[PDB]
Amino acid sequence: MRTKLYNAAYFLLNNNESFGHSFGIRLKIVGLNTWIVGYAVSRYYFSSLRVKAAQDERF
């Protein structure tokens, strides 16, 4: 059975003010949350790094 397909609306709909206005607030909140979580993850990541070792040192 040949599966049916569709054309995504957002790929063929002219840009409208409503989309921009709503997605602006959505992206503001998303950016706030992502920035907080990314700051936490960055603090976790950098603090996990090892200490600098000598030159040409084994173990």
Partner: protein, 285 residues
């Protein structure tokens, strides 16, 4: 006999996606034997064409050059001129011709609307693109599958239910002109599904979240004074994300060709649902 094909499918999918991105908006001229001097006097219509019945056919725009001085200035009129004169194999739904049935709802040059009561850019330079509704399965050309929409409409019980018998059976359910103006501007929906097909939430959750049109019909049946299943309808629509998924984009109201306000109806429905949830606790005590 068959065997695992995950690798072949993945490679084919990636390659096809890349090639489609490179060759997006694939266009085929209906009549390549046209001079540019002649094309100067004719407007260009890029009509989406696709025949899943034929295994050899794939989606594609077809470019038709037509004289706009031969038919009335409407998308449906142009489509029917193209069908009757150029290629009668084109498919499209049309019943009323005057924007009442709502069958001709298509993506008329980037905006969902009825093709019978929508004009097109008279300028001969800018082409006009005609495609079916976006997030609806395409059956053929400009025909989509609205069966899911019809089932969602069925799921709301759109019929007057009354728990109190009529006092005399020789009269009509009383309803004041104010209670009728309450329904005025709300029962005119023709179920053309443009607002639902433009609603972002409906794109993401076609099934779990009911369309703005269906929710507006539910709001109409709720605000109707004659019906008595107000709380019952509110509770039924308050399930899961049937209404909660709506994010108040307003594109439904913006696109509604009839001038209705499904956004306002949804806002009122949300207010009533919140009040119902609060008073289910406040009242019963």
């Amino acid at each position: 006999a068959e065997s695992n094909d995950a690798t072949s499918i993945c490679l084919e999918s990636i390659s096809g996606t890349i090639k489609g991105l490179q060759k997006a908006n694939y266009v085929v001229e209906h009549n390549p034997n046209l001079t540019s001097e002649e094309k100067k006097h004719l407007k260009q219509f890029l009509v989406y064409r696709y025949n899943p019945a034929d295994p050899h056919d794939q989606p594609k725009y077809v470019s038709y050059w037509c004289d706009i001085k031969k038919f009335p200035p409407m998308f449906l009129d142009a489509i029917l001129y193209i069908k009757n004169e150029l290629d009668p194999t084109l498919s499209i739904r049309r019943s009323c011709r005057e924007g009442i049935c709502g069958s001709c709802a298509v993506n008329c040059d980037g905006l969902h609307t009825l093709a019978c009561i929508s004009g097109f850019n008279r300028d001969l330079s800018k082409p006009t693109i005609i495609t079916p509704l976006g997030h609806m399965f395409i059956l053929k050309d400009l025909v989509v599958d609205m069966t899911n929409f019809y089932a969602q409409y069925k799921m709301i019980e759109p019929y007057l239910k009354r728990k109190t018998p009529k006092p005399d059976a020789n009269k009509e359910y009383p309803q004041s002109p104010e209670q009728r103006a309450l329904l005025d501007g709300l029962y005119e929906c023709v179920l053309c599904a443009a607002c639902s097909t433009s609603c972002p939430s409906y794109w993401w959750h076609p099934d779990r979240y009911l369309g703005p049109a269906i929710l507006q019909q539910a709001y109409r049946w709720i605000v109707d004074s004659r019906d008595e299943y107000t709380q019952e309808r509110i509770e039924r629509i308050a399930e899961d994300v049937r209404l909660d998924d709506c994010q108040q984009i307003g594109m439904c109201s913006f696109t509604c060709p009839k001038g209705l306000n499904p956004q306002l109806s949804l806002k009122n429905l949300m207010d009533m649902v919140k009040d119902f949830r609060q008073k289910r606790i406040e009242q019963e005590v």
